[PDB]
Amino acid sequence: MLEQPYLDLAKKVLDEGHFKPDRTHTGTYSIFGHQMRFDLSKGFPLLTTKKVPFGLIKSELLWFLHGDTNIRFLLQHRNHIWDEWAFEKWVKSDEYHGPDMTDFGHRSQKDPEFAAVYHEEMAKFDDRVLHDDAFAAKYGDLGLVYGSQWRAWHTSKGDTIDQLGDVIEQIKTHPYSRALIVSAWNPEDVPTMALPPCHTLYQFYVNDGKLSLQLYQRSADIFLGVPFNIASYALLTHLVAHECGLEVGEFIHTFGDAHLYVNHLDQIKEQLSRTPRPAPTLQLNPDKHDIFDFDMKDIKLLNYDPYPAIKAPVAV
Amino acid sequence: MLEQPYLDLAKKVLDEGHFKPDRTHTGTYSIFGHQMRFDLSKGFPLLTTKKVPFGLIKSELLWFLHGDTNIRFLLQHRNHIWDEWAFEKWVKSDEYHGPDMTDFGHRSQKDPEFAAVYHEEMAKFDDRVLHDDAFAAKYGDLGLVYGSQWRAWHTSKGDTIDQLGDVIEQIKTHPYSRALIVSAWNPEDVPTMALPPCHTLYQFYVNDGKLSLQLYQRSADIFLGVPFNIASYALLTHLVAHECGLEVGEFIHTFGDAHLYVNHLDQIKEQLSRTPRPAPTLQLNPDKHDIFDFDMKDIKLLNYDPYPAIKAPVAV
Ligand SMILES: O=c1ccn([C@H]2C[C@H](O)[C@@H](COP(=O)(O)O)O2)c(=O)[nH]1
Ligand SMILES: O=c1ccn([C@H]2C[C@H](O)[C@@H](COP(=O)(O)O)O2)c(=O)[nH]1
Numbered sequence: 001m002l003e004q005p006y007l008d009l010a011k012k013v014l015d016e017g018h019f020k021p022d023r024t025h026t027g028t029y030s031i032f033g034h035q036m037r038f039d040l041s042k043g044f045p046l047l048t049t050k051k052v053p054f055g056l057i058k059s060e061l062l063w064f065l066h067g068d069t070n071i072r073f074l075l076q077h078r079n080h081i082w083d084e085w086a087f088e089k090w091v092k093s094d095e096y097h098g099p100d101m102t103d104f105g106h107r108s109q110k111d112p113e114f115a116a117v118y119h120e121e122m123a124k125f126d127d128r129v130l131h132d133d134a135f136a137a138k139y140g141d142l143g144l145v146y147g148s149q150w151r152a153w154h155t156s157k158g159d160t161i162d163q164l165g166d167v168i169e170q171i172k173t174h175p176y177s178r179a180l181i182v183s184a185w186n187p188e189d190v191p192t193m194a195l196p197p198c199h200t201l202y203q204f205y206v207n208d209g210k211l212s213l214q215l216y217q218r219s220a221d222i223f224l225g226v227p228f229n230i231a232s233y234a235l236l237t238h239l240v241a242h243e244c245g246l247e248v249g250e251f252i253h254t255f256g257d258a259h260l261y262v263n264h265l266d267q268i269k270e271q272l273s274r275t276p277r278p279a280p281t282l283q284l285n286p287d288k289h290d291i292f293d294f295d296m297k298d299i300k301l302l303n304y305d306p307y308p309a310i311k312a313p314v315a316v
Numbered sequence: 317m318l319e320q321p322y323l324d325l326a327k328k329v330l331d332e333g334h335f336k337p338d339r340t341h342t343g344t345y346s347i348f349g350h351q352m353r354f355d356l357s358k359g360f361p362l363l364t365t366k367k368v369p370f371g372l373i374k375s376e377l378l379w380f381l382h383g384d385t386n387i388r389f390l391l392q393h394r395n396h397i398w399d400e401w402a403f404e405k406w407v408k409s410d411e412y413h414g415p416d417m418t419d420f421g422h423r424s425q426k427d428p429e430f431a432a433v434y435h436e437e438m439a440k441f442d443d444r445v446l447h448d449d450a451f452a453a454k455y456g457d458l459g460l461v462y463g464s465q466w467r468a469w470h471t472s473k474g475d476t477i478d479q480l481g482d483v484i485e486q487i488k489t490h491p492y493s494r495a496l497i498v499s500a501w502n503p504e505d506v507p508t509m510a511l512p513p514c515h516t517l518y519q520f521y522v523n524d525g526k527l528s529l530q531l532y533q534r535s536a537d538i539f540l541g542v543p544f545n546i547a548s549y550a551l552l553t554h555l556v557a558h559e560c561g562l563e564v565g566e567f568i569h570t571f572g573d574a575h576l577y578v579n580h581l582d583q584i585k586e587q588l589s590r591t592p593r594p595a596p597t598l599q600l601n602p603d604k605h606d607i608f609d610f611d612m613k614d615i616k617l618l619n620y621d622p623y624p625a626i627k628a629p630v631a632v
Contacts (some may be wrong), residue, residue: 004568018523020492020523021492022492022493023493023494030523032521032523032530032566032568033353033528033530034571035349035350035351035570037349052547063468090359109593111354141505153503153504154472155472155504156470156471156472156474158472161503161504163503164587166507176336176337176338176339176570177339178339178534178535178573179512179534179535181501181512181516181534181572183499183501183503183516185497185499185501185517185518185576187469187477187479188469188471188472188477190495193614196495200497200499200517201499201501201516201517201532203534203572205348205572207334207336207346207348207571208334212348212349214348214572216517216532216570218494218519219493219494219495220499250348250349252348252349252475253350254351254532254570256494256519256530257521258595259511260479264535292618314331
């Protein structure tokens with residue numbers, strides 16, 4: 001079926017993936033360099049071998065698409081994918097008066113009581129970002145997250161470039177352009193970032209009237225990351241095609257360091273014994289065409305019928 | 317043999333490569349998305365199925381390595397790879413008093429006399445850049461060529477970053493870093509460039525004590541470009557390893573738009589009937605270690621024994 005390339009990457013890593021020490025304190029089995037591709041005319045590459053929440057994907061993408069850097073948008077749609085990053089800022093600031101929270105991610109993963117204290121504090125934070133406009137403005141704003149690199153690349157003139165909106169125009173005028181690239185990697189900022197963009201750079205290509213996208217990920221966590229990463233960019237490819245009145249082609253996923261955290265081995269294995277089902281089908285709103293103005297209800301997933309979810313530890 | 321991956325890309329493009337209109341006015345057969353890899357412990361991937369001038373590769377690389385943007389360095393080593401770009405600037409400037417030269421590349425490819433006039437003017441230019449220090453400084457300096465993007469990324473503070481020297485330090489301190497990336501793609505400059513960098517971005521990786529590099533090329537001309545592109549980055553990988561006291565691993569070559577100009581079909585075909593020979597062997601100077609201070613005589617190619625050269629039209 002459609003998702004086989006994923007399953008083959010997992011198998012691949014389990015076999016010849018070498019043990020390499022990673023930034024976190026968990027180990028990894030990894031390979032360097034891998035291309036994988038999905039034919040979007042065959043369906044949406046949302047894994048059926050485990051329930052992946054399409055909502056977190058759909059709302060996070062619109063977030064980037066709006067050039068939004070404030071977590072407040074995510075939280076209103078019950079998306080806490082980025083909470084961790086806002087919170088850490090809030091914690092080491094002068095206005096924080098409460099439990100230590102140092103190394104919170106590790107400490108919570110290691111202490112029962114702490115985790116509960118953590119969720120009380122993070123619960124407080126999420127309420128402040130939601131209601132206190134000044135708080136949201138001072139702590140919910142991440143600054144350098146995708147939607148900013150995509151839609152507001154700050155120039156040396158202090159100006160700002162809409163990389164994405166710009167390339168979409170070139171796609172409509174010079175479809176045969178071999179430079180329809182959007183990059184999220186800025187050398188001046190990357191050395192002072194908690195996490196440089198994993199999704200370094202992507203490229204569009206148009207031939208025979210159908211759109212294609214190739215993403216370059218410098219670091220991927222197979223079991224947890226990739227299932228989300230694939231759906232995000234396959235979805236981007238759809239929306240861009242919708243806008244450009246083009247047909248959908250292929251999503252090519254190139255990798256740098258593709259890895260599997262050792263604390264995920266049993267889970268990946270169990271998944272590897274499941275039989276892919278017929279991939280779901282995506283439906284974008286026919287009437288709406290400005291994908292920058294698209295909202296939740298304009299993107300639908302039909303016939304998604306996956307296997308139960310596989311819970312697994314997040315590495316630290 | 318070693319170069320089979322190249323030959324397979326060529327075969328691949330000839331078979332399912334679709335005809336796509338390109339920027340120039342020649343046509344192309346192309347594919348979007350391709351990974352190819354070479355095991356540098358097996359030898360240097362300099363094609364034996366046709367004589368590729370290692371010198372133009374070796375001297376151009378040192379050029380980039382020195383953060384040099386002035387063509388004057390190339391010309392002293394009889395390298396005219398970049399002349400075309402300096403010259404065009406010189407031509408449309410106030411100080412140019414001579415034959416029209418408009419569209420010179422095409423006009424020369426189309427007129428016998430013109431071509432001779434062209435080579436007289438370009439001969440003049442090359443002598444001025446070589447001897448007139450102010451001329452060299454005003455016309456030989458390209459400004460935004462690789463060695464600048466690599467070793468002097470201009471920041472928004474007007475400052476300058478040595479991307480390359482910086483990553484080499486991280487390789488020596490955090491070998492297991494999944495962010496050892498050097499990028500040559502700057503969104504603010506790319507929309508005002510004759511040719512945005514084809515060699516968009518590369519990534520290093522270290523495991524089991526041996527270095528690896530993966531290059532991402534957004535546009536490749538199989539017959540003419542790639543044979544040079546491969547040797548350039550395989551060589552970079554060697555020098556970086558030499559510096560870091562590491563072993564050499566693999567060169568992974570990912571592609572965006574890989575193409576074959578139709579005016580190269582007979583030539584590629586003829587090459588495809590040749591039988592690869594044993595790949596040559598590279599030797600870097602054992603005593604010298606600062607690769608930024610390396611010069612010609614510190615890099616040697618042993619046992620290179622290729623088939624005759626294949627002359628073919630440059631597309632325009
Ligand atoms: O969408 C994403 C975002 C992150 N990661 C992972 C990759 C690594 O596991 C970690 C980033 O590690 P570093 O390369 O920064 O060290 O986060 C993914 O797999 N997918
Ligand atoms: O080292 C190089 C440099 C350039 N090119 C080619 C790729 C294309 O043939 C042309 C650049 O075309 P655009 O993508 O800019 O349109 O130059 C190569 O193959 N190898």
